Amino acid sequence: SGLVKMSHPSGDVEACMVQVTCGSMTLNGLWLDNTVWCPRHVMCPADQLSDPNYDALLISMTNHSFSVQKHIGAPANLRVVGHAMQGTLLKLTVDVANPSTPAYTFTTVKPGAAFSVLACYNGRPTGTFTVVMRPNYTIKGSFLCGSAGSVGYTKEGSVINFCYMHQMELANGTHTGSAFDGTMYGAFMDKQVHQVQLTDKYCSVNVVAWLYAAILNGCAWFVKPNRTSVVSFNEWALANQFTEFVGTQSVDMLAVKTGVAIEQLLYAIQQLYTGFQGKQILGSTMLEDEFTPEDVNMQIMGVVMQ
Amino acid sequence: SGLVKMSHPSGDVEACMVQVTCGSMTLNGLWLDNTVWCPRHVMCPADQLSDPNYDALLISMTNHSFSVQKHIGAPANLRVVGHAMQGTLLKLTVDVANPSTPAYTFTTVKPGAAFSVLACYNGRPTGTFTVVMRPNYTIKGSFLCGSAGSVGYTKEGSVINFCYMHQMELANGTHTGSAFDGTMYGAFMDKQVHQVQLTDKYCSVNVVAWLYAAILNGCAWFVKPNRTSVVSFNEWALANQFTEFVGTQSVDMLAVKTGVAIEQLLYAIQQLYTGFQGKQILGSTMLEDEFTPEDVNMQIMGVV
């Protein structure tokens, strides 16, 4: 029992992290097979970060402009033998294939989805934490200068989905990055100018998951027979900066396990949003929305008599 | 910027995890050098877990009673060539040294100290999270049956300090385990009977660190010129379910960086304990005490 924020074991991703340098600038990259991925802003002199001309920067490079180091973990000696730009990322080709390349995909994640982040500096894995892709296409992380190129991922069995490469900080504790197709989440630009940030929202389906976790952990004071339909809830959500609730198999499994209907927790959310009545839920006195239905199912896993 | 619950990368410890089987029971173990550490209740069949006779069980075992297997991972079989009971742990000697043994030490953590946990089932790592040793010598984690033998540790410079091997659940969301000398944190018994826990307390020094983190993340609304002395705070703490505040260099570095004295934050704590009254600190409406001064200094100033 218990529900806490937890991340995937990081070892197989740690074996893929490298340091990438372009002249005077250094950041992190991800080595898979004969490719190293990194932020294209490694090419940009400090004094040009407010208005980079990335096409001109790329033209100015040769394969010799870049180096890749891996001194940490299983060491490797790598030479850059090709370079290309794909959106907001560089795709470097190296002469040695990573001998510990995991089975992987590159698939962009949607808001409300959680992933593990391996925060790195100078190619050294430093910490790991879990974030949720927010409704405004930011993540709420902990990153300092030099963390660009840190990666985010999920795992399903042995298959890793690489979904995030860190780029920038927008505001205190507010971050964003690229998907591995080279697009930036939220269409933010890798340019240091002001950029519009849409308002964040509570992720309704995750709040529902957390309340189910609470019930499964013997905290059910907020359950009443009162229901709010998914339709009425969604109408309310549009007025109260909650996301649209979309039910899933994962949420349905929690409803079956607890015997409490989704609609009972939608009603509970509307009430708890106005106040917790001097009470706590799983040690919190405010709504929690970064525990997904999948995370709760994994943490409260049980055999089922049939 | 930002402050989040964070754990160490787990790969070095992943490379040390094995499963240990004895009879019908399979748990996790930690393989370092020619030694495998695991919970002693691996000996006790599941139906006997509420009143184990560990001495009688131990007398009945031979080296052949224990099977140790390492999963891919780098593969390894492994033969047990010795065994000893050390408090609530078994220390098994095996015939092959772990070729990926990290630089390590064994430590015993104190209340308020944080460590990373690598949660494992049948020798396979499934997740990692960070906990604090509570003032009542429990931890608040997320563990299911089969997780015993999971490993808690910190990393100091180049060295892993192993400090916890998971043993049991005491109540919902409330766990304990042992140090590697075999001593259970909080002196709880490794048996499946109800055991009373001491009342938990807020970890004062960690609440201070978190308030400093808040100030360093543009959240300083609670700062006033008012002060409460360390001595006066600690008298108040005895009566109000707070631990004794003891200053450290890590805390002083935060005081210097922010220009806000420890005593301003001790006063703030005394007012905030009564409730936040519709206000938030770093996204929370309650006091947070599982961010240590060292964690804050790392996350905010990068001070390895």
UniProtKB/TrEMBL annotation, chain B:
Domain Peptidase C30 residue range list:
1-304
What subcellular locations does the record give? Host cytoplasm, Host perinuclear region; Host membrane
Function, as annotated: Responsible for the cleavages located at the N-terminus of the replicase polyprotein. In addition, PL-PRO possesses a deubiquitinating/deISGylating activity and processes both 'Lys-48'- and 'Lys-63'-linked polyubiquitin chains from cellular substrates. Participates, together with nsp4, in the assembly of virally induced cytoplasmic double-membrane vesicles necessary for viral replication. Antagonizes innate immune induction of type I interferon by blocking the phosphorylation, dimerization and subsequent nuclear translocation of host IRF3. Also prevents host NF-kappa-B. signaling.
Its family remark reads: Belongs to the coronaviruses polyprotein 1ab family.
Name of the featured protein: ORF1a
What organism does this protein naturally occur in?
Middle East respiratory syndrome-related coronavirus
What is the covered span of the full protein?
Answer: 3248 to 3551 of 4391
